[PDB]
């Protein structure tokens, strides 16, 4: 009966921006791949096809060459810019979101203009207004780890279903995917990045594992106990199976040195740890 | 300040099953990507390891299989019986989330075993369980769709930054990715994703467009006001721009032939179209 | 010590076309990935980087959108175009490889401007002009297929390493690609595509299969005595494994209902079937 | 007429293997993804389904597993035990195609068990067998370069179709895929292989490039130079254009620094660097 256009958003999505700084021979990179949308009062143009409060995704691509003209020190502070030009610049926008994914480059051998990719793995960076309000949330992906041996899976409970075997050591593998919010838009954005990426790496390799719920947790905890600008730490870890092969039927043992590294299926363990009295469910998750 | 563990899951993602039913020679198929993920009490499972509570991932894997044996009239029925067995097998397990995609197939000259893919879509299912409380979310992905006329965009704001050009004919091609929620879990699940795609598909062609939003505002409409058992339906759909090519450098002209189909950047145009009065932000669609 | 300069090509890769045909109401559309390399006396280029030669892949790219504003009635009369205009347009030039993927549309319920994309299946063909000689090899892949009986495996050896039990049902599934040379350029092009296409998936169905090599035999067979202006096709068949899911565990039998698609490893099969008397390994295969 | 079985092979493909060494508490890991087809008299699987030279690709596969057990001192050393093993041990297989890629991995803090993947390139080596003979192609991929100066295009011819302005100062980025045949078994290939992966890189960076023909001629030419092991290697760079983005519409200028990154088209330069009299064309790059 009665239709209501409810939560909405638009703009350009994966803008792939790579920005030179050769004010010296001494050349610097920077690589983002950028997402623009707004939000606020768009119903005419969905109701009605009226795009008087459209601004046009094309000139939100053009607004983001035209900033990185400027230079910026971190990707956070390139979105923060991005993202009070929209909501002050047009009095039906109201807020929006603005993403960013941060590739790296390693210098060939220190030279000077010459790099090569390094893709181990991926920084993220999410930018949230609301009204007078904003939350940036950063994150990392991509980084694949995995642990030959000091992880166990045992005392699990057994029903009709259940065929797996217990152990004390298997492989215990996965893609590091974590994503935090900051309390504060007052941080040092690449310091902060490289210091809970160490966090995350050092409580993975370092705790004896007796589950992967375990070793999430320790992962977040060493994050939120590192960094007080950090409320929360929401984390989606695969368990990539890495079958210990039988090789009895040819006659050999296998003392846990030959693997098959399956696809799928995968265990997937999600959780968020968080600051005791954090805001619960903050709405840039939503997405 | 203290640690704590909030919102997670667990469970194995992507188990791909195919049932075949084979009763007769008439044979048909039916092959699902499922994800299996509980929700309860699993605070020992992270702070300390025990594993009393975490009901194994390969456990859930087999089930998925064990309850294939006995055939499932839907995608959507197959999840309901898993979700419900999780749930009422075990008392710290309150909720969860089973998920997953259908792949569709067509017979080979009408043969009665013999089956080609089609992939020009895939069906997509999520059921969330809360306590008693089932939500379902049905939704289509990866359909490609595109208008060669019949599509306009002008009256737009022109700020500092817009170059893009107001036009009476352009091409308008999308990816139609929607999800919608059932506000009940008894329904004719193929009838009405069939339905449901039709009348994506025709709202999509027949609407003479002004604006991707608005395309997109009828495509919900025509959903919301056709089927009382939906309260909402969600669209993320990029605008994929071909790019009319100028050829006048070249002594021609294009009168709306020749495009150049761009892959990055894209228009990214996401909404909500509710029925009046229905849930705000049901927490099936957090994840 | 003495290095010399062997094989070389060089070009525009990927080059995304759509050419709408709009002379009536009725629109069509033909969409295309489009390669262009030529090859020739680039010595200079590699050695000293003399570009006097080197007609750039930017104007190779427009030359692909130019030369489509005239239209064209295949794919392969397209590339015969392009080839012929690059090797006699320039003295240098003595050769190339042009090369093209066709992606398939359907009208959205016959609509006169409104398509889904048919992603089941894509389209290739590929020309090579080599001073006055060219050949074509046109090709389908992507269409994945699935027999859920009528398959067989046994009498196999079993060495200490064999493992696999016989069996006389079970399913089998593969992506079909396949690429044919014709024997001459006059050819009704979209008619042998269409029928080269049927045939294969004919014998795929029909074959009672003893293994996968015989029915790969058997597909190229059919196209072989069906077309005269082919002189041999090569296909690449996977055998993507349909594991029957072991439910005794669970109080149950698998009576070849429930299986488990795994994404690797598979098997892969693959033979040249020719025409009696026909070349033996045409430069055209090499790439 | 007369329809022929041609060149064909089979066998197990992309077979993920991990092999981890543990004899000490300083654990190493070895990562493929390896591939093994078979070459000889099948004419009677193919033409009756006789299955009596079939060796099982599922015994391929665990032969590949139980060969790990022992360990392998190099990836090369590895196909070669295959190769060997299959050719030998059936009489009426002749010979085959071995090949795996080889993924990286680094220690975490220099753990002892701890490791994160290196996925900045991807390491590859087939080895081929027909009859007495034997060669190895070993090669690299994925590794993405790019220069933000020393690179220029001038001098190219200019036709109707030539719109692409001349410059002395471009970005220069490019994925590295090569591939060099050994003359010899007898090398120390991971040294080889970390030789030529430094002089590729060198000669890329170094090389004032007035064309990506001549970079890749300068980066193979060094390989040669440098190695009697090497008779040729073959290369397939993409220019990945980075296009410098016209800001003075706005009033700016960009001196080199603001660029959009283009996925598609992209050139596709392509090259064989050989020793001076060596084979023109090995059997082994047919496949
Ligand atoms: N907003 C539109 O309907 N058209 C588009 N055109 C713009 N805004 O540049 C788009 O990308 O979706
Ligand atoms: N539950 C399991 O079968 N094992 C797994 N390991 C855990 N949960 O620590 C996983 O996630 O696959
Ligand atoms: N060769 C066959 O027909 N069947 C297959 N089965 C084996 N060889 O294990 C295969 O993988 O293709
Ligand atoms: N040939 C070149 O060195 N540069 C390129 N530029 C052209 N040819 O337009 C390319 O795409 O490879």
Redesign the interface.
């Known amino acids: 009966?009665?239709?209501?256009?409810?939560?909405?958003?638009?703009?350009?999505?994966?803008?792939?921006?790579?920005?030179?700084?050769?004010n010296t021979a001494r050349?610097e990179?920077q690589?983002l791949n950028v997402?623009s949308?707004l939000r606020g009062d768009?119903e005419a143009?969905?109701?009605?096809?009226?795009?008087?409060?459209?601004?046009?995704?094309?000139?939100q691509?053009?607004?983001v060459?035209?900033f990185?003209?400027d230079?910026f020190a971190t990707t956070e502070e390139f979105l923060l810019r991005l993202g009070k030009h929209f909501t002050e610049?047009?009095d039906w926008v109201t807020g929006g979101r603005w993403a960013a994914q941060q590739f790296f480059?390693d210098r060939?051998?220190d030279?000077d203009?010459?790099?090569?990719?390094?893709?181990?793995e991926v920084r993220t960076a999410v930018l949230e207004i609301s009204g007078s309000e904003q939350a940036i949330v950063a994150g990392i992906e991509?980084?694949?780890?995995?642990?030959?041996?000091?992880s166990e899976?045992?005392?699990?409970?057994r029903?009709?279903?259940?065929?797996?075997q217990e152990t004390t050591d298997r492989?215990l593998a996965t893609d590091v995917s974590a994503r935090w919010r900051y309390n504060t838009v007052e941080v040092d954005f690449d310091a902060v990045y490289a210091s809970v990426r160490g966090l995350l790496?050092?409580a993975?390799?370092?705790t004896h594992?007796?589950?992967?719920?375990?070793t999430?947790?320790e992962m977040?905890?060493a994050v939120?106990?590192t960094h007080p600008e950090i409320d929360?730490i929401k984390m989606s870890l695969?368990?990539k199976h890495?079958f210990l092969?039988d090789?009895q039927?040819?006659?050999?043992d296998?003392?846990?040195?030959?693997?098959?590294?399956?696809?799928?299926?995968?265990?997937?363990?999600?959780?968020?740890?968080?600051?005791?009295?954090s805001r619960?469910?903050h709405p840039i998750?939503?997405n």
């Open positions: 009966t009665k239709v209501v256009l409810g939560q909405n958003q638009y703009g350009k999505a994966e803008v792939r921006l790579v920005k030179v700084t050769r050349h990179i690589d997402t949308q768009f143009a969905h109701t009605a096809g009226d795009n008087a409060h459209v601004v046009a995704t094309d000139t691509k053009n607004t060459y035209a990185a003209r230079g610049g047009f480059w060939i051998n030279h203009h010459a790099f090569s990719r390094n893709k181990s991509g980084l694949t780890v995995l642990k030959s041996t000091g899976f045992h005392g699990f409970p029903d009709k279903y259940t065929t797996l492989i790496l050092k993975f390799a370092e594992s007796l589950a992967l719920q375990q999430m947790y977040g905890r939120i106990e929360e695969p368990n890495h092969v090789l039927p040819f006659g050999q296998n003392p846990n040195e030959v693997f098959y590294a399956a696809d799928r299926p995968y265990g997937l363990i999600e959780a968020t740890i968080q600051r005791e009295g619960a469910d998750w939503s």
